[PDB]
Design an enzyme around this catalytic site. Structure first.
Site, PDB file in Angstrom:
ATOM      1  N   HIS A  15       0.814  -1.209   0.082  1.00  9.45           N
ATOM      2  CA  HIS A  15       0.029  -0.141   0.140  1.00  9.45           C
ATOM      3  C   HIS A  15       0.872   1.408   0.025  1.00  9.45           C
ATOM      4  O   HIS A  15       1.808   1.507   0.820  1.00  9.45           O
ATOM      5  CB  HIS A  15      -0.916  -0.051   1.178  1.00  9.45           C
ATOM      6  CG  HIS A  15      -1.668  -1.213   1.505  1.00  9.45           C
ATOM      7  ND1 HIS A  15      -0.992  -2.491   1.935  1.00  9.45           N
ATOM      8  CD2 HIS A  15      -3.024  -1.638   1.449  1.00  9.45           C
ATOM      9  CE1 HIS A  15      -1.950  -3.302   2.155  1.00  9.45           C
ATOM     10  NE2 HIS A  15      -3.115  -2.922   1.644  1.00  9.45           N
ATOM     11  N   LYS A  75      -1.809  -8.508  -3.638  1.00  8.49           N
ATOM     12  CA  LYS A  75      -2.689  -7.277  -3.429  1.00  8.49           C
ATOM     13  C   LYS A  75      -1.780  -5.860  -3.556  1.00  8.49           C
ATOM     14  O   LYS A  75      -0.741  -5.869  -2.646  1.00  8.49           O
ATOM     15  CB  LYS A  75      -3.430  -7.247  -2.106  1.00  8.49           C
ATOM     16  CG  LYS A  75      -4.120  -5.907  -1.665  1.00  8.49           C
ATOM     17  CD  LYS A  75      -4.465  -6.051  -0.330  1.00  8.49           C
ATOM     18  CE  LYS A  75      -5.315  -4.734   0.054  1.00  8.49           C
ATOM     19  NZ  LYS A  75      -5.518  -4.216   1.431  1.00  8.49           N
TER      20      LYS A  75
END
Length: 226
Positions: A126, A151
């Site tokens: 992230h 992810k």
């Protein structure tokens, strides 16, 4: 398999209780059986994670669950040493056997090797500041490790950044059809990337209980209609 304690895009719904009382008060009324629940355990202090866990896993029996320790380096609410991070993950895995376990790749790359026996890892990254120039390399590096899920979540500074996240996702899904990807361009600016999960090859989309579970289900209907 079972833990020491018994019992088209999918929507992941994060839950962030800050104590056991809040955990037991979580409302299942808006969640459906196909929604995946993400327990953001980083909303708790280290010493409360194991104490809250039984309530989380009782509450969400019959749902797929992601166990997530998001660190402060990546927009999360906890900091943990390598040792404590691994201990908590391993104990949760042994006790409750969550369907998926988040592993914050760049924060804990060194000790990823100690997770060699895990086949349900979400290798996650992230970036809340920008969409890195080397985004393609990030996709490549995480893919090469072949986790259960790759992810990637990034912050756009312009429209092209959003399109780049979308394009890299479909590009890597085309190259790697058996690799599950969950990706998103964050912020209002990046919203289309979340609506476009099916188009881009993201297996999941995150909706809140910035777009609500209510609206996400509606837009799914719009996109899925004949």
């Amino acid at each position: 398999s079972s833990g020491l304690v018994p019992r088209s895009m999918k929507i992941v719904v994060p839950v962030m209780p800050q104590n056991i009382e809040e955990a037991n008060q979580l409302d299942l009324t808006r969640i459906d059986s196909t929604d995946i629940i993400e327990w953001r355990a980083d909303y708790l202090v280290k010493d409360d994670i194991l104490t809250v866990a039984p309530a989380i896993f009782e509450k969400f029996s019959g749902h797929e669950v992601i166990f997530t320790l998001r660190t402060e380096k990546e927009g999360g609410n906890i900091s943990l040493s390598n040792e404590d991070y691994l201990a908590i993950i391993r104990d949760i895995a042994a006790l409750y056997q969550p369907d998926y376990i988040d592993f914050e790749y760049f924060s804990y790359r060194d000790v990823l090797e100690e997770m060699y026996d895990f086949s349900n890892l979400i290798l996650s990254y992230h970036n809340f500041e920008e969409t890195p120039e080397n985004l393609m390399e990030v996709f490549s590096e995480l893919t090469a490790l072949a986790p259960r899920v790759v992810k990637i979540a990034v912050m756009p500074k312009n429209e092209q950044d959003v399109l780049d996240l979308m394009n890299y996702t479909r590009g890597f899904k085309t190259l790697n059809p058996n690799q599950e990807y969950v990706t998103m361009s964050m912020s209002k600016l990046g919203r289309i990337s979340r609506l476009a999960a099916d188009l881009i090859g993201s297996s999941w989309t995150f909706a809140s209980l910035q777009i609500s579970l209510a609206d996400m289900r509606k837009i799914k209907e719009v996109l899925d209609a004949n």
